[PDB]
From Swiss-Prot:
Lineage, highest ranks first: Viruses, Duplodnaviria, Heunggongvirae, Uroviricota, Caudoviricetes
Residues at the active site: 11 (proton donor/acceptor), 20 (proton donor/acceptor)
Protein name, UniProt field: Endolysin
Catalytic activity reported: Hydrolysis of (1->4)-beta-linkages between N-acetylmuramic acid and N-acetyl-D-glucosamine residues in a peptidoglycan and between N-acetyl-D-glucosamine residues in chitodextrins
GO-annotated biological processes: cell wall macromolecule catabolic process; defense response to bacterium; peptidoglycan catabolic process; viral release from host cell by cytolysis
Organism for this UniProt entry: Enterobacteria phage T4
Length: 162
């Protein structure tokens, strides 16, 4: 298992513009287009991202390309963040993937806000961090996904995804 396969499972793949769990226009593999309520604004961002007049529909290759860029950006966001970097550096491979997943989902800013959880991860207090990670809107809004990511932090294995 790896970061790509993990996120492909959590986000799924959709070739036409759709609304995410929060109701925002998205496409492909969890690629947020805009938070704006307008479909046109969404279509405009899509075309700008792909480089062609899409009409709200992309190909698989196009979805994957956005996905590669998005994963790359998540990692780079973590490494550039003063709060996140040190955590990330302290973790093993599986747990690093869990942190990337969260950043992909909520943004660096969002994750950087889990101050207490981050400290616990850094200290390697797995069970404690898992409980703390669960006391959040994130867990309450997308519990199944949250549960899978939390298990990875807790156990250091991909069991939840197998
Ligand atoms: Cl983009
Ligand atoms: Cl969920």
């Amino acid at each position: 298992m790896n970061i790509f396969e993990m996120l492909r499972i959590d986000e799924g793949l959709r070739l036409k513009i759709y609304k995410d769990t929060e109701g925002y226009y998205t496409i492909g593999i969890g690629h947020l287009l805009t938070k704006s309520p307008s479909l046109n604004a969404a279509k405009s961002e899509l075309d700008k991202a792909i480089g062609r007049n899409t009409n709200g529909v992309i190909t698989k290759d196009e979805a994957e390309k956005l996905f590669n860029q998005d994963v790359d950006a998540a990692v780079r966001g973590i490494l550039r963040n003063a709060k996140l970097k040190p955590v990330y550096d302290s973790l093993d491979a599986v747990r690093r993937a869990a942190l990337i997943n969260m950043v992909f989902q909520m943004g660096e800013t969002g994750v950087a806000g889990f101050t207490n959880s981050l400290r616990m991860l850094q200290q390697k207090r797995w069970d404690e961090a898992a409980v703390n990670l669960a006391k959040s809107r994130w867990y309450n809004q997308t519990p199944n996904r949250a549960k899978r990511v939390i298990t990875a932090f807790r156990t250091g294995t991909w069991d939840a995804y197998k």
